[PDB]
Design a protein around this ligand. Structure first.
Ligand SMILES: Nc1nc2c(ncn2[C@@H]2O[C@H](COP(=O)(O)OP(=O)(O)OP(=O)(O)O)[C@@H](O)[C@H]2O)c(=O)[nH]1
Ligand SMILES: CN[C@@H]1CCc2c(ccc(O)c2O)[C@H]1O
Lengths: 331, 52, 231, 280
């Protein structure tokens, strides 16, 4: 009946992909010279948080950044001179995410209270509270000065209107908790990796799912667009990373090693898209090669689990945070 | 519920797909073209490095 | 130029002065996590997204968290509570015949899952076996036998170190059988890093705050003793 | 004398190596910087200064049987001896009291001990040790009165130790006797608490289911066996005339000396310290 009808389409989808596999990415990029050896050293260390850190977002100016911690603070730093600029106290001590507006006027926050809060930096006080989700917030990203996309643990995502606090549209289709999301460079599509080991490509204007990828074997923790915008990468807690192509609609390469068994908490790309930086549970960060899947560096300056990772817009520095309440700038 | 899943899969089945070779070539071309302005790949002199 | 350079250093000093003052309060308070089996009556104990309460006893601050806003079967948010003093687990001991596997089996499975967790590998559990009078009445009356649902209750005998307090010989056996059923799971998995503290609780009594205080004191004392290699 | 120069050369290297390693590990790593590590660092610094500026000169003076640095350097060496011995024993008392406060009263321990209070305590301990050593000795209030003492003080080639009854008694009391009883009381209380906690654990889950004695035995026995006979004969040889020889005095003094080398093995047996040492 209906159940058997869905099975027939699944075979048709799989068959169509198999006809387009002319070759593999590893074969094509065999003749290009390797990147070599990459070594990075800590330039700055930021102190002041009383507890572990989960969130961190760079500024558009590539100089200011924000961070969140369970002690209930939202501190804005100055990476150049190492000077604290702001310190916003939160009503709820369980914060799981944070974001920084493209214009630098607002900062968002959220966590186990099922609410997203917006703060007015240039006025600091709470400006808006958004409610309606039935699960803990996992991520939030600013579309523009008046729109924001959030994902929660009720297996749904939504798009908000800060002026009136109403869900413009709702995205459904996942069967597990949504763990992360990332916006396209042009801000028309975004992807979300959930706990059902699947990632979907949504349309902001229309509000419908377009493509689905089901490569991983366990919970998906991180996701990030390629700088071009035609690909993305994910990281699960089975110590594997995969690169998916939207146009070919299939996985291209896998990044794994035989000496790693810990989970992956965060991923990010480089300015040119050649390097792939991923954070792990073994207290250190690894640097991969996107075109060859070969390790090229290790960042081993942290004494606890690494929870967040980010690269500046100009590609000048990499910031990492960990559970020992310290941030570090690597260059 | 069952009807909605059937309708969704039909939409995903009718998608034009290009060869893997084309996508790999495009990615390689983009990386080769933009490898010049990658401060993390080639280290920058300390004069133009704000952190050192 | 140099005018703005000194301006930033003035605001940093004010912020750093506030962080030092708030650090004293953070280190002098103890955080507790409250759980439940679904119909264990954990809200009555508290009365007598997330809900939090503040209370102090003997001039010591405590802070309790109740998570009723997340109804998911799996618990992805349980890794955030890896730096709490203790976990309070409330179970209805008078639900061995309610199919709702019965409720006691589900509670035991949840306790086993919580105990054998990668992140919660150094946190003790304070266990409240609630609804004692319902269990006593149901045991004293007929038409319900524990060995029907738990066959191991037969051939089980009351331990010698028991403190029945002016009680029926029967009721006393059932309580200790359930407590040992929990302690068997508690002891095997862990070795020296965290313990379990079972209590027999009802709705009338009001000594639960003193019990929480005493188990917290014991937890911290054992932590220090083990750290100094004296235990 | 050939054998003595070899064995006594190992004591110099053992003291400096162990104490330097402890100091570098604490300073280099941010995770090893706590309140107790401040006291440990103070004790390590005292032991390092002792092993750097006491053992070599004393060894040379014993081997050559003649002091070749004048009277002023002899006085300075004696002052350093007293300062470094006094300031090392008094830190063990601080560590014992810290453990006592940590275990007996666990709720108030965080408020009681802070970085500023620890710094004040360490500075006060070092000040009190300084008043005992430099102030009386440099002002010639420790000198004896017999003819032999007068001759040895007059001669510029010999540097021997002579004191009166009051100074010997007061210095011995302040350096050794109060800390001994304080730590004995503290560790008795700690052992009692550990015993009752073990009894509670056994009563709770005995059916389903020595270290304190060994640890306390090591901690008390090393210190007592190292430092008790010397501080007994320090009073015996003044109360009783012509009863204690000089060779016995020196031997007991050196037996007390080696405790500085022994300390880092006792007070740095932690997984974090072992990891820090391995990372070096
Ligand atoms: N006799 C008795 N009844 C209890 C006891 N605890 C809970 N109850 C029952 O529980 C009812 C009140 O609800 P709560 O105890 O607050 O249960 P709850 O808030 O739903 O707790 P959860 O289901 O775990 O969320 C009362 O009408 C009682 O019948 C108890 O200790 N003794
Ligand atoms: C030269 N050796 C000295 C002699 C007396 C003495 C010592 C140490 C502590 C004291 O309080 C003393 O009075 C010894 O180290």
């Amino acid at each position: 009946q209906l159940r058997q009808e869905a099975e027939q389409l699944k075979n048709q989808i799989r068959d169509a992909r198999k006809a387009c596999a002319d070759a593999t990415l590893s074969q094509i990029t065999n003749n290009i010279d390797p990147v070599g050896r990459i070594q990075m050293r800590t330039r700055r260390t930021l102190r002041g948080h009383l507890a572990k850190i989960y969130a961190m977002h760079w500024g558009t100016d590539s100089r200011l950044l924000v961070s969140a911690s369970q002690d209930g603070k939202l501190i804005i730093w100055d990476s150049y001179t190492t000077n604290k600029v702001h310190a916003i106290p939160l009503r709820s001590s369980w914060v799981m995410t944070c974001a920084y507006a493209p214009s630098g006027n607002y900062v968002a926050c959220g966590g186990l209270d099922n609410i997203c809060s917006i703060y007015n930096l240039k006025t600091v006080r709470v400006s808006r509270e958004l409610a309606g989700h039935t699960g803990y917030l996992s991520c939030c990203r600013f579309l523009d000065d008046n729109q924001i996309v959030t994902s929660s643990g009720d297996t749904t995502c939504a798009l908000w209107d800060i002026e009136t606090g109403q869900q413009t549209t709702t995205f459904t289709g996942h069967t597990g908790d949504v763990m992360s999301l990332s916006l396209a460079p042009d801000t028309r599509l975004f992807v979300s990796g959930a706990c059902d080991a699947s990632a979907k490509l949504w349309d902001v204007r229309e509000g419908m799912c377009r493509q689905t990828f089901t490569g991983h074997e366990s919970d998906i923790n991180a996701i990030c667009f390629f700088p071009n915008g035609n690909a993305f990468a994910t990281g699960s807690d089975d110590a594997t990373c995969r690169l998916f192509d939207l146009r070919a609609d299939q996985e291209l390469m896998t990044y794994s090693h035989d000496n790693i068994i810990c989970g992956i908490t965060s991923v990010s790309f480089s300015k040119s898209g050649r390097l792939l930086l991923a954070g792990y549970d073994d207290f250190n960060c690894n640097v991969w090669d996107a075109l060859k899947a070969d390790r090229a560096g290790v960042l081993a300056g942290h004494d606890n689990r690494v929870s967040c990772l980010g690269v500046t817009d100009d590609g000048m520095a990499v910031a990492t945070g960990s559970w020992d309440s310290f941030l570090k700038i690597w260059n | 519920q069952a009807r909605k899943l059937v309708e969704q899969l039909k939409m995903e089945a009718n998608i034009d797909r290009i060869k893997v070779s084309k996508a790999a070539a495009d990615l390689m071309a983009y990386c080769e073209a933009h490898a010049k302005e990658d401060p993390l790949l080639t280290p920058v002199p300390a004069s133009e490095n704000p952190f050192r | 130029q140099r005018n703005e350079e000194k301006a930033q250093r003035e605001a940093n000093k004010k912020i750093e002065k506030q962080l030092q003052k708030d650090k004293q309060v953070y280190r002098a308070t103890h955080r507790l996590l409250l759980l439940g089996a679904g119909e264990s009556g954990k809200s009555t104990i508290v009365k007598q997204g997330i809900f939090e309460t503040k209370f102090q006893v003997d001039k010591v601050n405590f802070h309790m968290f109740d998570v009723g806003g997340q109804r998911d079967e799996r618990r992805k948010w349980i890794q955030c509570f890896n730096d709490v003093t203790a976990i309070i687990f409330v179970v209805a001991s008078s639900s061995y015949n309610m199919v709702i596997t019965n409720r006691l089996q589900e509670a035991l499975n949840l306790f086993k899952s919580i105990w054998n967790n990668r992140w919660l590998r150094t946190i003790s559990v304070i266990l409240f076996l609630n609804k004692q009078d319902l269990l006593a009445e149901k045991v004293l009356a007929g038409k319900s036998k524990i060995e029907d649902y738990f066959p191991e209750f037969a051939r089980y005998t009351t331990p010698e170190d028991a403190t029945p307090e002016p009680e029926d010989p029967r009721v006393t056996r059932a309580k200790y059988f359930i407590r040992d059923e929990f302690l068997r799971i508690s002891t095997a998995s862990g070795d020296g890093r965290h313990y379990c503290y079972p209590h027999f609780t009802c709705a009338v009594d009001t000594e639960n705050i003193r019990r929480v205080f005493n188990d917290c004191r014991d937890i911290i004392q054992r932590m220090h003793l083990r750290q100094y290699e004296l235990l | 004398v050939v054998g003595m120069g070899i064995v006594m050369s190992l004591i110099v290297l053992a003291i400096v190596f162990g104490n330097v390693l402890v100091i570098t590990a604490i300073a280099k790593f941010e995770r090893l910087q706590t309140v107790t590590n401040y006291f440990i660092t103070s004790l390590a610094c005292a032991d390092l200064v002792m092993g750097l500026a006491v053992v070599p000169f004393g060894a040379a003076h014993i081997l050559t049987k003649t002091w070749t640095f004048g009277n002023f350097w002899c006085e300075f060496w004696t002052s350093i001896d007293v300062l470094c011995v006094t300031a090392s024993i008094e830190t063990l008392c601080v560590i014992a009291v810290d453990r006592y406060f940590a275990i007996t009263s666990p709720f108030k321990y965080q408020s009681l001990l802070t970085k500023n209070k620890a710094r004040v305590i360490i500075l006060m301990v070092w000040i009190v040790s300084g008043l005992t050593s430099f102030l009386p000795i440099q002002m010639h209030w420790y000198r004896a009165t017999h003819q032999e003492a007068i001759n040895c003080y007059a001669e510029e080639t010999c540097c021997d130790f002579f004191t009166n009854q009051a100074y010997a008694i007061a210095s011995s009391i302040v350096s050794f006797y109060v800390p001994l009883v304080i730590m004995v009381f503290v560790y008795s209380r700690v052992f009692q608490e550990a015993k009752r906690q073990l009894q509670k654990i056994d009563k709770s889950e005995g059916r389903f289911h020595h270290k304190a004695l060994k640890t306390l035995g090591i901690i008390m026995g090393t210190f007592t066996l190292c430092w008790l006979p010397f501080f007994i004969v320090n009073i015996v040889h003044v109360i009783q005339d012509n009863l204690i020889r000089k060779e016995v005095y020196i031997l007991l003094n050196w037996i007390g000396y080696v405790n500085s080398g022994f300390n880092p093995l006792i007070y740095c047996r932690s997984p974090d310290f072992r990891i820090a040492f391995q990372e070096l």
